[PDB]
Symmetry: C6
Subunit: 189 residues, 6 copies
């Protein structure tokens, strides 16, 4: 029975955060995890199996899908959320070690928040560069195996576009909350 230690650890890390920014950030994080784990994962299930091209050339479908999707959106979002979460976990464990020292910091919190913001904007920029924020039903593919130009058709482009916009909005809200947090720490300083 050591429920008090976890409560004290939770209090210490939030002691340097805004009133209510912590709760909105945590709720938004669990919202994003729930959305990623159930809906978008099942939406992207048949990304290659339902992918089809109008050609008889063997191997054209493989290269055309590879060119159309350099990386799946779901795996990209998983990487983004992991990269966003890593600095927070680092800071939490560092504060845990600080408490262990106390039994026998603010600058690190600022660095973690700022790095999380950097990672979020970097992932957004990469998504804009590679894919944009929409998916087209018809993709024109010009790859070496395929003769001339071929037409290929994605799986559920519209629902994927909807989920892409949802994830973009979620990322933007998270970034805005992080900037507000940084501004509050600047105000305190």
């Amino acid at each position: 029975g050591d429920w008090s230690a976890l409560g004290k650890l939770l209090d210490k890390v939030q002691a340097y955060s805004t009133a209510g920014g912590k709760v909105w950030l945590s709720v938004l994080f669990i919202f994003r995890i729930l959305l990623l784990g159930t809906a978008v994962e099942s939406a992207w299930g048949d990304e290659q199996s339902a992918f089809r091209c109008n050609t008889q050339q063997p191997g054209c479908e493989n290269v055309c899908y590879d060119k159309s999707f350099p990386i799946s959106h779901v795996r990209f979002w998983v990487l983004q959320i992991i990269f966003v979460s890593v600095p927070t976990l680092l800071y939490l464990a560092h504060v845990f070690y600080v408490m262990r020292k106390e039994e026998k910091l603010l600058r690190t919190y600022i660095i973690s928040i700022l790095f999380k913001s950097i990672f979020e904007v970097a992932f957004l920029l990469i998504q804009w560069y590679i894919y944009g924020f929409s998916l087209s039903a018809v993709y024109t593919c010009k790859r070496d195996p395929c003769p001339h130009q071929v037409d290929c058709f994605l799986s559920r482009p519209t629902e994927k576009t909807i989920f892409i916009i949802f994830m973009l909005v979620v990322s933007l809200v998270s970034l805005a909350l992080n900037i507000i947090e940084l501004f509050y720490v600047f105000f305190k300083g």
Copy 2:
């Protein structure tokens, strides 16, 4: 061993709710989650794989399925339940922070309930606009790849219609309970 704290937290949030409205709302929520997680998820498993169109045009099936189902009903319902649940979690965590302040509100509960009602009615209206409340076995598809008009056939339209009506009834009951809750808070005020 800190079972008392969770009980006190549960008591505090329900202190502003009707006698018995809380239990009906919670039971209905777990009912909806159980129905969504087991039955309707398996019902929508072959939505695109069993989807078929009477044509020889390559890529016509993809675009016709995309036009017929801009977003899957199951994923739409997952989004709806998440959006309905978010304000409740926000209020619960806010009350937790209020208790933390007490160790060392009603307006937020009203706002959360009202926003949950807004989200429920908005999702119902969106479902009515895009899909309606029934599914037809035969869908006439007129999309660019397909020549003229083609006939396509959905997977298990009748069982999906039954589950759609079930979810509509569940959403209506939840909205009615929320309005009764709001009326009770108005009566108290």
Copy 3:
């Protein structure tokens, strides 16, 4: 460490039940859940994929399967068990609130038992009306896309019939136990 509270809650709800009826009902419920979760779910896995019709008409298989199975037996049974379980959960939570009042009913138990009986008989009648209690290997399908009449063949009809009879027997036993419970409460009154 609050094991005593759950024991007291368990005692209070069973205080109004017969000697031994509670244990048989609980064992039968867990039996039905185990049977539904493992065996019958896997038995119905290929209900549409292995479903086949003797025709060349595009879309005839879809409409014929839809007409043959308006709702899957497994999902129907899931709905039935959820509907049967809901009144019990309502009564348990109501008794929990009654204990909370005591810290600072029989009619509801009767109503819950009677409503559970009503739901059980209603689901049995619906199953009898739509399907009966057997499955035939060959189904004659007369639907609009299909020309004239077509012959279709179900997946594992015999094993499904066996499981249907098993579920019917389980439901009948549960209903009989519920009627015995109601008779005992009448005897007490």
Copy 4:
């Protein structure tokens, strides 16, 4: 912290059992559950999908598989283990209620053991009648859709035969242990 109550409940039920019969029976039960849950379930995964018949008749494969396998071996074994386990759970819960009476039997144990033996021998006899204890690679099918007689080929007959023999040996060992238990209770009486 109520670890003592579960220990006392465990002691009370085993108080009427042989020295060491309890441990062998429990180990054998967990062995059977582990074998059923991992190996044989995956072995029977493609029972119908890999099932093939040498014919061009539509629907012949469905009826031939249905006739060859009235019920899957894995589901049959799941039913058998559930039926064997039910009397033990009934007796355990009855002893729990007896302890509740004590805070404020042997004949039932004998009945449960004997009924478990009956169920085991009944399931063995049913398996012998329907299937035997071996699987043949080639099955001759004479069903109405199929013209004359057709040849069908099972999926992995040899490995399935091996697992069938394993389950038969496990069931025989369990029955022998149950008979030894009954003989010991007779010796005590």
Copy 5:
């Protein structure tokens, strides 16, 4: 809160084991379980589906796969690890009963270790007899349905061979540790 009892039970069983043999055996067991549960299970996923034969004879692929693989390697390894684990569980539960007697053995440990060694060597010999320790890409199949001799091709033979060698090395290390354990008990005696 009864953490002390499990620690005492752990101490009692290891009291008859070598210094460090216990930890190496436990680590090796968890290593084998982790390797079996994740890597080799996914490696053997398409053992029959990707299995192909150069023939037009219906049913030749089924019988050729059955003859090539009398039992899957993964299921064989699951059986082997279960058989190896059973004597250890028997001994642990026997020591638990011995402690229960104490509240109100070495020979069994020797027997369990020796039987575990016997089972390990028996499974290794069976694997050598049926399969050997390698898999060939091309299998020549001479079975009744197939005319003359046919050529069949396994799924991922090289990776399966690598995992087979890994499991062989793991089994050999476990057997060597068991023999060292037996020699130590002989030295003590």
Copy 6:
């Protein structure tokens, strides 16, 4: 309630580690496990099913896939992480036994760290030898069943290349941290 013992065990093992090296290593390990368990596993799902070759020769696809992928990257990475983790678990359990002795070492930590470094560099060298650090969309296959030379096409080569580079970077960071740890222990000595 024995939370103190686990804390003491955690303190003892980290007592010989650098300030902050432990936390970075642990965070990196959980990062690698999360990346392997969700993203790369789903990325490699259709490695053989989507693998295609431009030939009519039966069995050419099987042998060409086998030659192209002697072992899957995901299973190789699972083996690598297991091999890296094993020495750490050995050291932790050894320290646990040392504490048990204390109730009634540095050289082992050095050996475990150095062996973990050896395993990491060995797996990196093996990956470089067999595969390199990139995947090509088109693979030229010259195997016995296939006539002359055939062209085969991998599934999602670009996304797999991205994940391969990610895993390479992760492994390099882990190795660098291990070398820094060894240098610190040398400095202490």
